[PDB]
Amino acid sequence: MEFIKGFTFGWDSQKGYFKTERAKESLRLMQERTASEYVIVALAALQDTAHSTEVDFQGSHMVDDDELIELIDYAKSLGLKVILKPTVNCRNGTWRAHINFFDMDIPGEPTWDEWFESYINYQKHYAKIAEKTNCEMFVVGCEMVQAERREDKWRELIAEVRKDYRGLVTYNTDKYQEDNVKFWDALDVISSSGYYPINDWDRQLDRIEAVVKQYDKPFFFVEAGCPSRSGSALLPNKWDLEGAINLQEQADYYQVMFEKTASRSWVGGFGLWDWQTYLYDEKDATKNDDYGVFGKPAERVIKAYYQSR
């Protein structure tokens, strides 16, 4: 596997976003300003709470199949490779790492089999799209920490995805959880959200290196990045961190992340987080405290390193 110079796209998208010209424009800017060669198209189905059972991918929150195929087709037209990442959020705000049910099946109660029935049908639907558009990779889940223990149901899901998609298949685990997943053998690539503190890269990379050396599969940080806020470089996963705007902090994180990881040949790339479909105007970049790199010093750090290799 080649080093994945990737960037995440579309996380802000709702139904209709991908029909628009500005969506196509945000994508080209992302390729030109970053030198990304892969785009990770991250989408979010909806379920009501962390313990609901119906996973909704048809509502206004979700792009339609045709505008998704247009957008992927466009990315490939720009010369991009495409990684398709369909995940789930909760309407009540709960981070999906908490989706979880009783180990036992209780009569009046939601079960793992119900949630996996819906989530697998969600997954199969976009596996079919990943195959017909020839996506290079498909990531069947994202940061499902409390659900990772159901390795039986995940392999069932993976099996169902393989019936629909011939390509590379991975699961996206959370920071510090790279070894929590006991089903990497059923997959082709290992990937985590590498939101690691700016002062802790040596210890964490060393920990992950021992884990991936057991598997003989490529690995990459399918999520990684940092808001431009004071305090963000210590907790870069915290999207809602409270801090003053700080563009240098974001660039410093990126600069150290690449220094620390360029030495590990097993770090197989990044899905940097994240590039919005509806991009803010450049004039506004210096006032943006968010993950975006457009028009910030970090934009130049990322492209320079993606040039490096």
Q: In whole angstroms, give the CA distance from residue 92 to residue 130.
A: 29
Q: Where are the domains of the chain?
A: 1-309
In 3D space, the residue among 242, 238, 253 whose CA is nearest the CA of residue 198 turns out to be: 253
Where do we find the tokens 């796209």? 9
Resolution of this model in Å is: 2.3
Residue 261, judged by CB atoms within 10 A of its CB (0-12, 13-18, 19+), counts as buried
Structure tokens at 287: 């006032």
Q: Which CATH superfamily is domain 1-309 in?
A: Glycosidases (3.20.20.80)
Please report the sign of the dihedral spanned by the C-alpha atoms of residue 266, residue 269, residue 270, residue 271: negative
Contacts with 272 (C-beta within 8 Å, 6 or more apart), sequence order = 6, 7, 8, 34, 36, 224, 225, 293, 302
Q: In whole angstroms, give the CA distance from residue 194 to residue 268.
A: 12
Contacts with 195 (C-beta within 8 Å, 6 or more apart), sequence order = 175, 223, 224, 225, 235, 236, 237
Neighbours of 258 (CB within 10 A): 17
Q: In whole angstroms, give the CA distance from residue 224 to residue 258.
A: 11
Q: In whole angstroms, give the CA distance from residue 251 to residue 32.
A: 18
Contact present, 70 and 18 (Cβ < 8 Å): yes
Q: Are strands 81-90 and 168-173 parallel, antiparallel or unpaired?
A: unpaired
3-class DSSP assignment, residue 245: strand
Q: In whole angstroms, give the CA distance from residue 256 to residue 260.
A: 6
Contact present, 178 and 218 (Cβ < 8 Å): no
What is the separation of C-alpha 210 from the centre of its chain, rounded to a whole number of angstroms? 23
